[PDB]
Amino acid sequence: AEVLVVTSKVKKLIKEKGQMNTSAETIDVLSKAIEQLCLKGVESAKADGRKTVMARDIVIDHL
Amino acid sequence: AEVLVVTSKVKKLIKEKGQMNTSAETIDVLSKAIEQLCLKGVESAKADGRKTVMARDIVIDHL
Amino acid sequence: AEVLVVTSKVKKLIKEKGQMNTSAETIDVLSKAIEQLCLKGVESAKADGRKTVMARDIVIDHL
Amino acid sequence: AEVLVVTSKVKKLIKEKGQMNTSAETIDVLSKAIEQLCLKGVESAKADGRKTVMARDIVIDHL
Amino acid sequence: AEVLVVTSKVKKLIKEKGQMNTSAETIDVLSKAIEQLCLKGVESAKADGRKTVMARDIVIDHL
Amino acid sequence: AEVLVVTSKVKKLIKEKGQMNTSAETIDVLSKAIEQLCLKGVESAKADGRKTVMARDIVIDHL
Amino acid sequence: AEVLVVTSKVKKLIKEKGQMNTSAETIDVLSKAIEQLCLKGVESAKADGRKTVMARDIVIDHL
Amino acid sequence: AEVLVVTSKVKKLIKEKGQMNTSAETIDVLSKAIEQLCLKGVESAKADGRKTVMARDIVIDHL
């Protein structure tokens, strides 16, 4: 259930910017990264008493 | 540019798992996170001498 | 009998310079071009009474 | 740089079909002709919207 | 020019019947055997004043 | 069963080099000759303790 | 630390009996199966107050 | 026949992790377990249409 990335555009980016192919399992791991980022965003909004996940709730300072 | 996440499923997961809405720019920064994961993947693959970004090249331990 | 081009290096050139794949039948047509160029080189050397095909005998002014 | 022709078979074809030797730089310019055919092939494929250099993209009618 | 054997089916036969791999140069030698067999078949038909190579013109009594 | 020769190129070589046609069963027996060469190749490789049928295992001196 | 299967003989068995290749990660999973079987054998001997793992302590009734 | 486990490391793991000795036929049945896992792996791969026994073909959930 639920693939959260747009496969064709991810592949195009990796081909265009990196001159590489993309494994199918790569798409799966990226989808799981999105899942984890949204779950943390929801916990970050709830800890602030808001009802909307905002860009500031998406934490990528470890990126 | 370029939306790399499936917006409808991101919103559906956030509403279904946290009851919240999803701001517009949340999609934007989720997409930026994908771009960065993909570009690190290309660097990981290049350092392995490979031409394919594989699951092993996408590290999401910090998320 | 006789493939006259170095397949792996032709493919690498097209991938590197053109960001493209190479069909197997492409290698065949390039080999036939080499065959035609050598046959004309031999006729060009013979018309000059020489026993050696030289660079000047390889005509690519139609290129 | 980069030799794109199979030198031993080029020499063997020239000796076997014309009884002649093959100068060193004959290989060099045969290789240059390959580079040019490949680069025109990439342009032909791009104008077709393709990502693969195919036999149809290598025109050797003038040779 | 001209590979006269069907590579994939030759490899399958050697793998299936002999439990072995097949070198690429093996395919070349088999193609040359076919070339020699057809050239002799043409000489055998011509010596009989026929215009068609037939099975009887393919001599493998030395096999 | 199994056609092991490239019929179109066999016919083209026979018409181009001898001006003749090629009967149907000529292909069949050419294919049988391939089967026999391959099976002798497997025996040659086995007697060398190898697992790969190589050019050295295909003897076509008698043809 | 510790590869518990004899790689070359496992590969030979799969090639001989199954006519197949063996992935390197296959050897790893088999080693882990051996590790799990010995750990259970030790618990089975201890539960009987013995100091020696015996064949009867190696349980493969789920096999 | 054929010992498929590394006896010295099996014994060392059993002595180091349980302080016990290892009977002779324990090695024998550990080896039989390997044979059976490999033969099920071949069946799993065949049902996938593959020619390689991979990690996915070795199921050790029941152990």
Author numbering:
A (entry chain H), B (entry chain D), C (entry chain H), D (entry chain D), E (entry chain H), F (entry chain D), ...: 2 to 64
What text appears in the publication on this structure?
Here we report that histones are major chromatin components in the bacteria Bdellovibrio bacteriovorus and Leptospira interrogans. Crystal structures (<2.0 Å) of the B. bacteriovorus histone (Bd0055) dimer and the histone–DNA complex confirm conserved histone-fold topology but indicate a distinct DNA-binding mode.
This structure shows that Bd0055 contacts the DNA with only one L1-L2 binding interface across the minor groove. It employs the L1-L2 motif that is conserved across the domains of life, although the sprocket arginine that reaches into the minor groove in nearly all other histone–DNA complexes is missing. Surprisingly, rather than the DNA bending around the positively charged histone surface, the DNA maintains a straight trajectory. Additional histone dimers bind the next two phosphates through L1-L2 interfaces engaged in identical interactions but flipped by 180 degrees. The filament is stabilized through protein–protein interactions between histone dimers that involve the basic DNA-binding ridge and the acidic underside of histone dimers 1 and 5, and through exchanging N-terminal tails between dimers 1 and 4. This nucleohistone filament, which is characterized by a histone to DNA ratio of 1 histone dimer per 2.5 bp, reverses known histone convention by completely protecting straight DNA from the solvent. The crystal lattice we observed suggests the possibility that bacterial histones might generate higher-order fibre packing through the interaction of histones on adjacent nucleohistone filaments.
